[PDB]
Amino acid sequence: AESISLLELCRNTNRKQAAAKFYSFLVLKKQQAIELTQEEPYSDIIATPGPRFHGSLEVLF
Amino acid sequence: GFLKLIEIENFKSYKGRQIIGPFQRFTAIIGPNGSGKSNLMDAISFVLGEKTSNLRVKTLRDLIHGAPVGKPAANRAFVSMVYSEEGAEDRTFARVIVGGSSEYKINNKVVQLHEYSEELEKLGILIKARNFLVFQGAVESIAMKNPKERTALFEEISRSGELAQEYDKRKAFEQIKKERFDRFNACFESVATNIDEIYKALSRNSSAQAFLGPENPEEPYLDGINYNCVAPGKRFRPMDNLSGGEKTVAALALLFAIHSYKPAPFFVLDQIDAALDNTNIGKVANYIKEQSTCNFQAIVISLKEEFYTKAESLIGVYPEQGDCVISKVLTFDLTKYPD
Ligand SMILES: Nc1ncnc2c1ncn2[C@@H]1O[C@H](COP(=O)(O)OP(=O)(O)O)[C@@H](O)[C@H]1O
């Protein structure tokens, strides 16, 4: 299955952009487009497919 | 001291045991609508002793996750706050819901509400006054007060308003007239000393100016409190004659200057930017960022990216569906990125 790291998505971005990517994980999780895993606080946030969206997560981001 | 983290268990939409934070000196709580931002606010109020009726329930057990739908998830719930002071071990303050009443604990020793309140006061946390909290509309509430209502607010916070009934009772009554005076000035003069520098900082402009003055310099409680501002590019006016955005900044300066007297170690700001605009929202945000470094820890619940991107730390809230809704939090560090 397909997985996506927020910290990789955020490499070479500024604070506004990084925060917007973070906020998008919250929005996409509410809409059930993804699942979220964070092993421990302030560690990496991993996105995986969710029940309500089926296209490529890579392309989604 | 500083609020290091919150541990929640089965409180409102925070099903199960969850760790909130750790906090940084400037942390913003964000998320899409209905995920649990304001319940987290209630969690903080709850561990700091807020009365049940201010927590949007009718009774204590309705705070347990699942109670509003008739399906409580446990017989017991709690919120704990880990408080850390450089030089000392960490202290845990907890309020547990046990058989429909509150159990208070410090470092896992049950205490009564009096001891809990008293130990919190010694840290500068005042649970009855709520010095740590800026509610929504707090700005607009301030911005609407006239000199006499400002005195009243100063009467309450200084508590000279307590000596008020005993005051005119004695009409050599200067014994209390001197001490209602001194109790009003112990508070007012500190605010008056600080408001000018706060107003420059907020305005981000050294030519801004602010003055707070008693109308009756002898018995200030008897009269209004005049508030004058030199807004950037204007001439000194009474604050009440200011206009939209300019009035908002002066309100904000007066708000923070009220809180610079006996400040709380940490400051919970609940959507203080719902009444801002791009023409100033970042100077409020930059002010908070600047103050968080040494003066106070800031915990902002915010909806405006131009505010919460100045934070060091983002606690993002998101929902799942279940009994009611299930809230969970992610932590994200903004200090890795530039701009
Ligand atoms: N005891 C509870 N158990 C489960 N869900 C609750 C409980 N109390 C409140 N909620 C839910 O919390 C949800 C929204 O949380 P809230 O913090 O108020 O929204 P927002 O993120 O917009 O501030 C509401 O759907 C509400 O039904």
- Residue in B305, B320, B327, B332 to test binding to A, most A beta-carbons within 10 Å: B332
Q: Which atom of ligand 1 is nearest to the CA of B32?
A: 21
Question: What size, in residues, is chain A?
Answer: 61
> How would DSSP label each residue in B1-55?
-EEEEEEEEEETTEEEEEEE----SEEEEE-STTSSHHHHHHHHHHHTT--GGGT
Domain spanning B2-132+264-333, CATH class: alpha beta
Query: Looking at chain B, which residue has its C-alpha nearest residue A19?
Result: B309
The boundaries of every CATH 3.40.50.300 domain in chain B are 2-132+264-333, 144-254
B202: amino acid identity, one letter? L
Domain containing residue A54: 4-60
Pocket probe for ligand 1: among B33, B39, B315, the residue whose CB has the most ligand atoms within 8 Å is B39
Query: Closest by alpha carbon to B64, among B52, B50, B54?
Result: B52
Query: Which residue in B has a C-alpha nearest to residue A27's C-alpha?
Result: B32
8 A C-beta contact, residue B80 and residue B47: yes
How close, in Å, is residue A27 to chain B by CA atoms?
Answer: 6
**Which ligand 1 atom minimizes the distance to the CA of B63?**
1
- Write the DSSP symbol of residue B64: B
Nearest C-alpha neighbor of B48 from the set B157, B128, B135, B136:
B128
Phi (first) and psi of residue B126, to 5 degrees: -115, 105
Q: Hey, are the CB atoms on A26 and B35 less than 8 Å from each other?
A: yes
**CA atoms lying within 13 Å on the CB side of residue B33:** 0
For this PDB entry, the determination method is X-ray
Q: Is B32 left (phi over 0), alpha (psi -120 to 50) or beta?
A: beta
Q: Is B65 a pocket residue for ligand 1 (Cβ < 6 Å)?
A: yes
Atom of ligand 1 nearest to the CA of B301: 23
Backbone angles phi, psi at B257, to 5 degrees: -70, -30
Residue of chain A nearest B20, judged by CA positions: A41
Q: Is B31 annotated as a binding residue?
A: yes
Any binding-site annotation on B35?
yes
**β-sheet bridge partners, residue B300:** B28, B269
Q: Does domain B144-254 sit in CATH 3.30.360.10?
A: no
* Resolution limit, Å: 2.4
Cβ-contact B179, B219 below 8 angstroms = no
Q: At what angle do helices B174-203 and B281-292 cross, to 10 degrees?
A: 110
Dist CA B282 CA B244 (whole Å) = 17
| Gap from B311 CA to chain A (nearest CA, Å) | 9
Whether the CB-CB separation of B62 and B97 falls below 8 Å is answered with no
Chain B contact set for A30 (CB, 8 A):
32, 35, 318-319
Strands (E), B21-177: 26-30, 76-84, 91-98, 101-106, 109-111, 133-134
From the list A14, A41, A45, which residue is nearest B337 (CB)? A14
Interatomic CA distance for residues B285 and B294, integer angstroms: 16
Q: Tell me the CATH number at A8.
A: 1.10.10.580
Smallest CA–CA separation between A51 and chain B, in Å?
A: 12
Q: Which residues lie closer than 8 Å to B72 by C-beta, 6 or more apart?
A: B61, B64, B65, B66
